[PDB]
Amino acid sequence: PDYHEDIHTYLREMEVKCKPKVGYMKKQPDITNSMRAILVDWLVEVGEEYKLQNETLHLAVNYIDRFLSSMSVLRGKLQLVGTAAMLLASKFEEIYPPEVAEFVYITTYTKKQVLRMEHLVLKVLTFDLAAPTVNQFLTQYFLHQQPANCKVESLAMFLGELSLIDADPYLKYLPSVIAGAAFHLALYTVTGQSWPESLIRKTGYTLESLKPCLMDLHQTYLKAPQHAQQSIREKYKNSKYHGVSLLNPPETLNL
Amino acid sequence: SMENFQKVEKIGEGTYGVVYKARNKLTGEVVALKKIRLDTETEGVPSTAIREISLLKELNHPNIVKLLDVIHTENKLYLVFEHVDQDLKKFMDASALTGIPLPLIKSYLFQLLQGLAFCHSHRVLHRDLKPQNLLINTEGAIKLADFGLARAFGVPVRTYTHEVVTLWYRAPEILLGCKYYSTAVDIWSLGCIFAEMVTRRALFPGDSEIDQLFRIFRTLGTPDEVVWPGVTSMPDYKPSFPKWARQDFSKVVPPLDEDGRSLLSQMLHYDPNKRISAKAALAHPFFQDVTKPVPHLR
Ligand SMILES: NS(=O)(=O)c1ccc(Nc2nc(OCC3CCCCC3)c3nc[nH]c3n2)cc1
Known part of the structure; x- marks a missing residue:
């Protein structure tokens, strides 16, 4: 630090x-x-x-x-x-x-x-x-939780990992941006909280700049039980990742 | 590929491969060639080469050895580096009866802290600082070399390879089996080397892990929960450890004066969190009158 x-x-x-x-x-x-x-x-x-x-x-x-x-x-x-x-x-x-x-x-x-x-x-x-990865940005973003939340973390990793599967749309987003979206989405799903102010100061990203990625990620999250590929969902059922793929996605984001 | 290089002689073997001094026939440039034998039917390109090359291509800095090229056959890998003149160890041995001038010790530490702060800023851990891996030239420069044990780290760190750092220079948190070590392990090694530049013998010459720990405790005192919160919970901590009182630092490296001792003591802090970073150390009062003299020998 x-x-x-x-x-x-x-x-x-x-x-x-x-x-x-x-x-x-x-x-x-x-x-x-x-x-x-x-x-x-x-x-x-x-x-x-x-x-x-x-x-x-x-x-x-x-x-x-x-x-x-x-x-x-x-x-x-x-x-x-x-x-x-x-x-x-x-x-x-x-x-x-x-x-x-x-x-x-x-x-x-x-x-x-x-x-x-x-x-x-x-x-x-x-x-x-x-090379920088969604994962490297997530672990730094995780430092901004008050207090730290294992469900938030595992779910953020789960979402960031699902983004790896689908070239369209995710090739167009930078790792730091996917990580931003994944972190906000997880925080919101779990605790109702939003992309924190301290991360705006750190990254320069707001909910507005993350919005297009978030909209994509939210749709990927909702349609996840139906995707032809399922290994991430199965992997994230494990207690190691706090069973986060069993959690229900929110119906709306209200951004 | 190797057609434009004329081998001069072998320099040595570090972490992996073999290093040779050679000369570019076309430009006159004297280079160091790290020769790595590959094969197929075995493991492919070694993780040490993968790490070293990818990290050295990012780390352009006057105090970091410069990677010039990668010449990559199906059978052999050759890393082409700038050639540097001598290593610090050979130079300290050569200074047997003169000593190393304090301005030169101070210049070298300053430069080492620069190269190291640049590494740490670029999320690289060196993990093998020792005088043999530290190279000096005729113009007064010193450079970090042998990045064969280096790695890219994350924030915050996770668990990395335990069997890391040459024993004499190895930080107590590695010795005591901590699952997270970080940038502070390189600072420890540099503190050991600072002391060594002054006395010209290793500060902690152990022949085993426990021997090494005990040499550290006898000098700095046996760490307790006050000096290093958490120490007693560490995996290889033992309540049976002898409890040695801490030595006055004026006795640890007697020729060092007040500022030098202060800096050394912050580099050798037990608690890795309290140990000074390379960045913060650059502004230590020890360095207020730092210059860059050419070495005084050769
Ligand atoms: N013994 S010595 O004092 O005679 C002397 C030493 C090293 C060198 N030169 C030099 N050496 C390298 O690696 C040498 C290697 C040897 C084994 C330990 C790790 C370092 C380099 N890598 C990029 N540039 C390099 N330049 C010249 C003279």
Whole structure:
């Protein structure tokens, strides 16, 4: 907290540079948002199978979106991109990452393929893997709770994670903005409270600037039991995340 | 790829890979080449390389070793760095009978605190500060090197790798098994090095964790709930620990004067929350008359 503000400022700069290209899927000949949703959901599952950090998941998704921003990929190779990305995210973030063997096993492909794709992903991303995530902004926002609330936190993570699944609309929003929306939405759902004044001072964001993201996130939250992908909902039933996916979304936000 | 470099000699092996001095044949630039062997059929690119490269590309600072290029084959990785002239350890050994001038000690600590405040500001922990990883050039600069153990952290921190920092420089909260450590672990190491620049021997040369803890307690006193709230709850704290009285700091590093002792004592505070940050330390009165002389040897 000698550095909380320095770090936030720096992350705010880096998230703009680390941002995926918003319209990349129209340029992909053979893959769709729906195929990406499927892949991301599967990564959520891998995350749970191996008890990986939520941060590792958020990073892996950032690597995939930046990779696919410049590299055309056929549908049969999309899971190889996701595997290498999750392997890279784990090495960067985890104290004990799974071995290459474990990633080979969890996929279809060979160890040789996974490793070559790893080297390919690093080349394309030019080794720039310390990217800001919704998760990194949420944990800083969590500091502004009075008092701290575990349900608020888990629900904010749950909402921020659901945003990872759907490229349309969420590719267009910055991580700090998704985190803002997720935090307000959770706070409101749980306690009836709103985006605090101290976070306006910190971020420059108000309920007005967060509104478009919030409207999107609120709709995603309401329609969540009906989404084709369900791994996040199942994951967040666990006591580890205070069963927050069992909570009822509010019917309106009144913003 | 490596065609434009002529290897001169081996410098050493740090956390991972091998470092060589080489020269760019086209520009004349003398470089340090970190050679990393890969393979396939094994683990791929090491997490240490992934971290070091991605973090060093962000950390451009006069007091941080500069990463120039990454030359990436299917078999070998080569990090190209600016070459620096000598490490602090070799320089302290060379200063055997002259001592290191106080202006130079003060310049080096100031510069080290600058490089470290820049790291911490960019959410990087170094986690291996020791004289061998600190490099000095002919113009009076000192730089943090070997970012092989570094990592990006969050606010607030979560649990990171426990087996971290070379023992002599390792902070008491690591030694006592605390699940959260943070920026204060790098400041501790720097406090150990400040003392070492002055006396030219390690402040706490332990050969094991308990030995290391006990050397720390005998110098600074055994921490209790007054000096470090929470200490007695720490995982590897033991009520059986001998309770040593705290030494007067004028005896810890006798040549240091009032301002120097004050700064050292804030760097070596038990409680990581109370330990001074690198940022706050730059404005310590110790530094009021700081200059940047060239080293006095070579
Ligand atoms: N022993 S010594 O005093 O003769 C001397 C020492 C180091 C260097 N030079 C130098 N060394 C690096 O890593 C060397 C490496 C060795 C093992 C410990 C970690 C550091 C560098 N990394 C970027 N630039 C670098 N420059 C010149 C002379």
